[PDB]
Amino acid sequence: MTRLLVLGGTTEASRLAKQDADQGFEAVFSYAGAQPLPTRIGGFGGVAGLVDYLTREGVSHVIDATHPFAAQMSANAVAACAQTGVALCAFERAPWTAQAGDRWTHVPDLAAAVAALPQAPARVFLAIGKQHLRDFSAAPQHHYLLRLVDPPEGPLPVPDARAVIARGPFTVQGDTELLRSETITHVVAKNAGGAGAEAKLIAARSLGLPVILIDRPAVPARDICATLEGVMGWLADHGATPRGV
């Protein structure tokens, strides 16, 4: 009978994990690099790799609730599950939709984001965390602003840079103050994030400022579950059951 693997790295996953435990499913949870489920922390050694693991563990269903800018995992699951005949929903929160007063532009990747900043010097919230910040040195004439969950640990990759320290979950109040005091002119964001990720967008709207929005990476087709309720429905439809059935 049933045995689920949940690929995590998101709060949607964390929330899915509490359900599965609570309802008494047999499920393992998978970080790369606590949860209320047994937890596996490595990677799998590419595709198959995963196939080997899906086989030896006797996994019936996989839920890819990984981050949405973490595509190589998500696609590896697709292959491994396709080649293995193991079911697979993907629990992704639906990407953000613009609305009156937003002033958004869209770009494929980080590279395109850097290319879309203006010539004239600007003051630019890089709400990317995190990594590949290095890439914006390509436009050095801007005053950038960063939010890192850590201390810098070494200097700042970009010339005119001010960091700050990101506790979370962020809040419209906070993010608006932050942007206003820092006289931010543009925001750069990925189209992803749980928690109070959307606060910065709202604050940008409050102050009438543009966002450059990095669209999610391309990933092969797979059943998509946009909520928890759906995921659990999907699980029922595909014959999954808690302990005891």
Residue numbers in the entry: 1 to 33, 40 to 251
Original authors' sentences:
The apoenzyme and holoenzyme structures at 3.17 Å and 1.63 Å respectively lack the β2/β3 loop which is disordered and the apoenzyme structure is less well defined overall than the binary and ternary complexes. The N- and C-terminal domains have a relatively small contact surface, there is only 304 Å2 of solvent accessible surface buried between the two domains in the apoenzyme and only two connections both comprising irregular polypeptide chain; therefore there is considerable opportunity for the domains to move with respect to one another. The presence of coenzyme, which buries 361 Å2, limits this movement and the presence of precorrin product provides further rigidity. The picture therefore is one of increasing rigidity of the structure as first NADPH and then precorrin binds. The CobK apoenzyme has few contacts between the coenzyme and substrate binding domains; the structure becomes increasingly rigid as first coenzyme binds and then product and this is reflected in the resolution to which the respective crystals diffracted.
